[PDB]
Amino acid sequence: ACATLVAEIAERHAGPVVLIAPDMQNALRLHDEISQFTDQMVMNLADWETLPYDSFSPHQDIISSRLSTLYQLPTMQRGVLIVPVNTLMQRVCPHSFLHGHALVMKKGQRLSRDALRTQLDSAGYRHVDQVMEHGEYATRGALLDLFPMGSELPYRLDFFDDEIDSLRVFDVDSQRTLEEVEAINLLPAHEFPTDKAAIELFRSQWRDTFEVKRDPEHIYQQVSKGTLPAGIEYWQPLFFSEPLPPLFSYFPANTLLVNTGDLETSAERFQADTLARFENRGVDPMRPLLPPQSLWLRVDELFSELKN
Numbered sequence: 340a341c342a343t344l345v346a347e348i349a350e351r352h353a354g355p356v357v358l359i360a361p362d363m364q365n366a367l368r369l370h371d372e373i374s375q376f377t378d379q380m381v382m383n384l385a386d387w388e389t390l391p392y393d394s395f396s397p398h399q400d401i402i403s404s405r406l407s408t409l410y411q412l413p414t415m416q417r418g419v420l421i422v423p424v425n426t427l428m429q430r431v432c433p434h435s436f437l438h439g440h441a442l443v444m445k446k447g448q449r450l451s452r453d454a455l456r457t458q459l460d461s462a463g464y465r466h467v468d469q470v471m472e473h474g475e476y477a478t479r480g481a482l483l484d485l486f487p488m489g490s491e492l493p494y495r496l497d498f499f500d501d502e503i504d505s506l507r508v509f510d511v512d513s514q515r516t517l518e519e520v521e522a523i524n525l526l527p528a529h530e531f532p533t534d535k536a537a538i539e540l541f542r543s544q545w546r547d548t549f550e551v552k553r554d555p556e557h558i559y560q561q562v563s564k565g566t567l568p569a570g571i572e573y574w575q576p577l578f579f580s581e582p583l584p585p586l587f588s589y590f591p592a593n594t595l596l597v598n599t600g601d602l603e604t605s606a607e608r609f610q611a612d613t614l615a616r617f618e619n620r621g622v623d624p625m626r627p628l629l630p631p632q633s634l635w636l637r638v639d640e641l642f643s644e645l646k647n
Protein backbone atom coordinates (compact mmCIF):
# COMPACT_ATOMS: atom_id res chain seq x y z
CA ALA A 340 0.00 0.00 0.00
CA CYS A 341 3.01 2.19 0.59
CA ALA A 342 4.38 1.77 -2.92
CA THR A 343 1.54 3.08 -5.08
CA LEU A 344 0.84 5.95 -2.68
CA VAL A 345 4.45 7.11 -2.61
CA ALA A 346 4.43 7.00 -6.42
CA GLU A 347 1.32 9.21 -6.45
CA ILE A 348 2.65 11.65 -3.87
CA ALA A 349 5.91 11.98 -5.79
CA GLU A 350 4.02 12.49 -9.03
CA ARG A 351 2.21 15.55 -7.67
CA HIS A 352 4.97 16.94 -5.47
CA ALA A 353 7.25 19.73 -6.73
CA GLY A 354 10.19 18.02 -5.08
CA PRO A 355 11.75 14.67 -4.11
CA VAL A 356 9.84 12.37 -1.78
CA VAL A 357 12.00 10.47 0.72
CA LEU A 358 10.45 7.23 1.92
CA ILE A 359 11.86 6.20 5.28
CA ALA A 360 11.62 2.43 5.52
CA PRO A 361 11.54 0.31 8.71
CA ASP A 362 14.47 -1.86 7.62
CA MET A 363 16.77 -2.68 4.71
CA GLN A 364 14.81 -5.68 3.43
CA ASN A 365 11.65 -3.60 3.10
CA ALA A 366 13.67 -0.76 1.54
CA LEU A 367 15.16 -3.02 -1.09
CA ARG A 368 11.71 -4.50 -1.77
CA LEU A 369 10.09 -1.08 -2.13
CA HIS A 370 12.61 -0.09 -4.83
CA ASP A 371 11.31 -2.28 -7.65
CA GLU A 372 7.69 -1.96 -6.48
CA ILE A 373 7.65 1.82 -6.66
CA SER A 374 9.82 1.90 -9.81
CA GLN A 375 7.28 -0.07 -11.84
CA PHE A 376 4.52 2.41 -10.92
CA THR A 377 6.25 5.61 -12.05
CA ASP A 378 8.21 7.39 -14.79
CA GLN A 379 10.19 9.37 -12.23
CA MET A 380 13.63 8.49 -10.88
CA VAL A 381 13.64 6.04 -7.95
CA MET A 382 16.81 5.49 -5.85
CA ASN A 383 17.73 3.76 -2.63
CA LEU A 384 20.52 4.78 -0.28
CA ALA A 385 21.83 1.31 0.56
CA ASP A 386 22.94 0.45 4.10
CA TRP A 387 26.61 -0.51 4.58
CA GLU A 388 25.19 -3.81 6.01
CA THR A 389 28.00 -3.94 8.57
CA LEU A 390 27.36 -3.79 12.32
CA PRO A 391 28.21 -0.51 14.10
CA TYR A 392 32.03 -0.34 14.58
CA ASP A 393 32.30 -3.61 12.65
CA SER A 394 35.55 -5.43 11.94
CA PHE A 395 34.51 -5.63 8.23
CA SER A 396 34.35 -2.95 5.56
CA PRO A 397 31.25 -2.84 3.39
CA HIS A 398 31.30 -4.49 -0.05
CA GLN A 399 32.54 -2.18 -2.82
CA ASP A 400 29.34 -2.80 -4.80
CA ILE A 401 27.34 -1.28 -1.91
CA ILE A 402 29.73 1.68 -1.83
CA SER A 403 29.35 2.13 -5.62
CA SER A 404 25.56 2.28 -5.23
CA ARG A 405 25.75 4.78 -2.33
CA LEU A 406 28.17 7.06 -4.20
CA SER A 407 25.82 7.07 -7.17
CA THR A 408 22.86 8.04 -4.94
CA LEU A 409 24.76 10.72 -2.98
CA TYR A 410 26.13 12.18 -6.19
CA GLN A 411 22.64 12.41 -7.74
CA LEU A 412 20.69 13.47 -4.62
CA PRO A 413 21.31 17.27 -4.64
CA THR A 414 19.86 17.61 -8.14
CA MET A 415 17.07 15.03 -7.87
CA GLN A 416 14.28 17.55 -8.33
CA ARG A 417 11.62 14.89 -8.84
CA GLY A 418 11.32 11.28 -7.77
CA VAL A 419 11.78 9.05 -4.76
CA LEU A 420 14.63 8.18 -2.44
CA ILE A 421 14.07 5.11 -0.26
CA VAL A 422 16.21 4.88 2.89
CA PRO A 423 16.11 2.54 5.91
CA VAL A 424 15.69 4.41 9.21
CA ASN A 425 19.00 3.19 10.70
CA THR A 426 20.70 4.25 7.47
CA LEU A 427 19.06 7.68 7.54
CA MET A 428 20.47 8.15 11.06
CA GLN A 429 24.01 7.71 9.71
CA ARG A 430 26.01 10.86 9.02
CA VAL A 431 27.66 11.08 5.59
CA CYS A 432 30.57 12.59 3.76
CA PRO A 433 29.71 16.22 2.89
CA HIS A 434 28.54 16.73 -0.73
CA SER A 435 31.56 18.97 -1.28
CA PHE A 436 33.59 15.74 -1.16
CA LEU A 437 32.07 14.12 -4.23
CA HIS A 438 31.93 17.05 -6.62
CA GLY A 439 35.30 18.12 -5.27
CA HIS A 440 37.20 14.82 -5.48
CA ALA A 441 35.63 13.48 -8.67
CA LEU A 442 37.91 13.36 -11.73
CA VAL A 443 36.84 13.69 -15.37
CA MET A 444 38.56 11.75 -18.13
CA LYS A 445 37.91 12.86 -21.68
CA LYS A 446 38.73 11.66 -25.18
CA GLY A 447 41.88 13.41 -26.38
CA GLN A 448 43.05 14.42 -22.91
CA ARG A 449 46.83 14.71 -22.58
CA LEU A 450 47.59 12.19 -19.83
CA SER A 451 49.75 9.07 -19.90
CA ARG A 452 48.51 5.66 -18.74
CA ASP A 453 50.89 5.69 -15.76
CA ALA A 454 49.74 9.18 -14.78
CA LEU A 455 46.13 7.88 -14.70
CA ARG A 456 47.22 4.89 -12.60
CA THR A 457 48.69 7.33 -10.09
CA GLN A 458 45.39 9.22 -9.86
CA LEU A 459 43.39 5.97 -9.57
CA ASP A 460 45.58 4.65 -6.73
CA SER A 461 45.16 7.89 -4.78
CA ALA A 462 41.40 7.80 -5.40
CA GLY A 463 41.28 4.38 -3.73
CA TYR A 464 41.02 2.12 -6.78
CA ARG A 465 42.74 -1.27 -6.65
CA HIS A 466 45.22 -2.54 -9.21
CA VAL A 467 44.22 -6.05 -10.30
CA ASP A 468 45.19 -8.44 -13.11
CA GLN A 469 41.69 -8.34 -14.60
CA VAL A 470 38.89 -5.88 -13.88
CA MET A 471 35.73 -7.50 -12.62
CA GLU A 472 34.30 -5.45 -9.74
CA HIS A 473 33.65 -1.80 -8.86
CA GLY A 474 36.77 0.02 -7.71
CA GLU A 475 39.30 -2.03 -9.67
CA TYR A 476 41.62 -1.12 -12.55
CA ALA A 477 43.99 -3.24 -14.64
CA THR A 478 46.73 -2.02 -17.01
CA ARG A 479 48.48 -3.77 -19.89
CA GLY A 480 50.27 -2.17 -22.81
CA ALA A 481 48.38 0.86 -24.04
CA LEU A 482 45.24 -0.38 -22.29
CA LEU A 483 43.82 0.51 -18.89
CA ASP A 484 40.51 -1.04 -17.76
CA LEU A 485 38.61 0.34 -14.78
CA PHE A 486 35.25 -0.14 -13.09
CA PRO A 487 34.18 3.37 -11.98
CA MET A 488 32.22 3.64 -8.77
CA GLY A 489 28.60 4.41 -9.67
CA SER A 490 28.91 2.93 -13.15
CA GLU A 491 26.89 -0.07 -14.38
CA LEU A 492 29.81 -1.24 -16.55
CA PRO A 493 33.60 -0.91 -16.59
CA TYR A 494 35.51 0.97 -19.31
CA ARG A 495 38.55 0.28 -21.45
CA LEU A 496 40.87 3.20 -22.19
CA ASP A 497 43.39 3.20 -25.00
CA PHE A 498 46.40 5.45 -24.60
CA PHE A 499 48.18 6.37 -27.82
CA ASP A 500 50.89 9.01 -27.92
CA ASP A 501 50.36 9.54 -24.17
CA GLU A 502 46.83 10.71 -24.81
CA ILE A 503 43.52 9.05 -24.07
CA ASP A 504 42.69 8.06 -27.64
CA SER A 505 39.34 6.46 -26.81
CA LEU A 506 37.23 5.39 -23.84
CA ARG A 507 34.86 2.48 -24.45
CA VAL A 508 32.25 0.78 -22.29
CA PHE A 509 33.39 -2.79 -22.02
CA ASP A 510 31.77 -6.13 -21.37
CA VAL A 511 33.84 -8.25 -19.01
CA ASP A 512 32.39 -11.66 -19.96
CA SER A 513 33.12 -11.26 -23.68
CA GLN A 514 36.20 -9.07 -23.24
CA ARG A 515 34.79 -6.64 -25.83
CA THR A 516 33.98 -2.96 -25.92
CA LEU A 517 30.55 -1.56 -26.67
CA GLU A 518 29.81 2.11 -27.33
CA GLU A 519 32.52 4.75 -27.23
CA VAL A 520 32.11 7.65 -24.84
CA GLU A 521 33.50 11.18 -24.92
CA ALA A 522 34.29 11.19 -21.21
CA ILE A 523 33.72 9.36 -17.94
CA ASN A 524 33.23 10.69 -14.44
CA LEU A 525 35.51 9.06 -11.87
CA LEU A 526 34.25 9.22 -8.30
CA PRO A 527 36.43 8.17 -5.30
CA ALA A 528 36.42 4.47 -4.33
CA HIS A 529 35.24 5.30 -0.77
CA GLU A 530 33.06 7.85 0.98
CA PHE A 531 36.29 9.38 2.22
CA PRO A 532 39.59 10.51 0.63
CA THR A 533 42.58 8.23 0.94
CA ASP A 534 45.29 10.18 -0.87
CA LYS A 535 48.45 11.30 0.99
CA ALA A 536 46.92 14.61 2.07
CA ALA A 537 43.97 12.63 3.52
CA ILE A 538 46.32 10.26 5.35
CA GLU A 539 48.20 13.23 6.84
CA LEU A 540 44.86 14.71 7.94
CA PHE A 541 43.76 11.37 9.36
CA ARG A 542 47.01 11.01 11.35
CA SER A 543 46.71 14.53 12.72
CA GLN A 544 43.10 14.21 13.83
CA TRP A 545 43.72 10.72 15.17
CA ARG A 546 46.53 12.07 17.39
CA ASP A 547 44.17 14.78 18.71
CA THR A 548 41.69 12.04 19.60
CA PHE A 549 43.35 8.76 20.47
CA GLU A 550 46.54 7.22 21.75
CA VAL A 551 48.95 5.75 19.24
CA LYS A 552 50.70 2.38 19.67
CA ARG A 553 53.41 1.12 17.28
CA ASP A 554 52.01 -2.38 17.00
CA PRO A 555 51.50 -2.83 13.23
CA GLU A 556 47.96 -3.93 14.11
CA HIS A 557 47.04 -0.48 15.47
CA ILE A 558 44.63 1.48 13.20
CA TYR A 559 46.87 4.57 13.11
CA GLN A 560 49.89 2.49 12.04
CA GLN A 561 47.93 0.71 9.30
CA VAL A 562 46.49 3.90 7.77
CA SER A 563 49.87 5.68 7.98
CA LYS A 564 51.35 2.87 5.87
CA GLY A 565 48.73 3.41 3.19
CA THR A 566 46.50 0.41 3.95
CA LEU A 567 42.83 0.53 4.95
CA PRO A 568 41.92 -1.62 7.96
CA ALA A 569 38.81 -3.75 7.81
CA GLY A 570 36.05 -1.55 9.23
CA ILE A 571 38.05 1.69 8.74
CA GLU A 572 34.74 3.23 7.63
CA TYR A 573 33.79 3.69 11.30
CA TRP A 574 36.59 6.28 11.60
CA GLN A 575 35.25 8.09 8.53
CA PRO A 576 35.07 11.36 10.55
CA LEU A 577 38.87 11.49 10.87
CA PHE A 578 39.28 11.76 7.09
CA PHE A 579 37.47 15.14 7.03
CA SER A 580 38.32 18.43 8.79
CA GLU A 581 34.66 19.23 9.52
CA PRO A 582 32.08 17.01 11.23
CA LEU A 583 30.02 14.71 9.02
CA PRO A 584 26.69 16.33 8.12
CA PRO A 585 23.26 14.65 8.31
CA LEU A 586 21.97 13.06 5.08
CA PHE A 587 19.38 15.86 5.30
CA SER A 588 22.08 18.24 4.04
CA TYR A 589 21.84 16.58 0.61
CA PHE A 590 18.09 17.03 0.18
CA PRO A 591 17.01 19.59 -2.41
CA ALA A 592 14.26 22.16 -1.91
CA ASN A 593 10.75 20.87 -1.29
CA THR A 594 11.92 17.44 -0.21
CA LEU A 595 8.98 15.71 1.43
CA LEU A 596 9.60 12.96 3.94
CA VAL A 597 7.17 10.08 4.40
CA ASN A 598 7.35 7.56 7.25
CA THR A 599 6.24 3.97 6.92
CA GLY A 600 6.27 1.91 10.10
CA ASP A 601 7.32 2.33 13.73
CA LEU A 602 10.40 4.47 13.25
CA GLU A 603 10.73 5.51 16.92
CA THR A 604 11.29 2.07 18.42
CA SER A 605 13.42 1.01 15.48
CA ALA A 606 15.48 4.19 15.89
CA GLU A 607 15.79 3.77 19.66
CA ARG A 608 16.74 0.11 19.28
CA PHE A 609 19.58 1.01 16.89
CA GLN A 610 20.79 3.86 19.09
CA ALA A 611 20.77 1.55 22.12
CA ASP A 612 22.79 -1.03 20.18
CA THR A 613 25.42 1.40 18.92
CA LEU A 614 25.76 2.81 22.43
CA ALA A 615 26.20 -0.62 24.04
CA ARG A 616 28.86 -1.53 21.46
CA PHE A 617 30.70 1.72 22.02
CA GLU A 618 30.64 1.34 25.81
CA ASN A 619 31.77 -2.26 25.69
CA ARG A 620 34.41 -1.94 22.98
CA GLY A 621 35.26 1.77 22.81
CA VAL A 622 38.34 1.56 25.02
CA ASP A 623 40.57 -0.73 23.06
CA PRO A 624 44.33 -0.70 22.66
CA MET A 625 44.31 -1.26 18.85
CA ARG A 626 40.93 0.08 17.68
CA PRO A 627 39.62 2.77 20.04
CA LEU A 628 36.21 3.98 18.84
CA LEU A 629 34.74 7.38 18.07
CA PRO A 630 31.65 8.33 20.04
CA PRO A 631 28.31 7.49 18.41
CA GLN A 632 27.47 11.15 17.70
CA SER A 633 30.51 11.44 15.44
CA LEU A 634 28.79 8.93 13.15
CA TRP A 635 25.03 8.93 13.88
CA LEU A 636 22.29 11.44 14.56
CA ARG A 637 20.73 11.01 17.99
CA VAL A 638 17.10 9.81 17.89
CA ASP A 639 15.94 13.21 19.14
CA GLU A 640 18.04 14.92 16.43
CA LEU A 641 16.49 12.65 13.79
CA PHE A 642 12.91 13.56 14.75
CA SER A 643 13.92 17.22 14.88
CA GLU A 644 15.17 17.03 11.28
CA LEU A 645 11.90 15.25 10.48
CA LYS A 646 9.97 18.28 11.75
CA ASN A 647 12.18 20.96 10.18
Ligand code: NA
Pocket residue numbers: 346375376377378
Ligand atom coordinates in the same frame (compact mmCIF):
# COMPACT_ATOMS: atom_id res chain seq x y z
NA1 NA B 1 2.08 5.20 -12.70
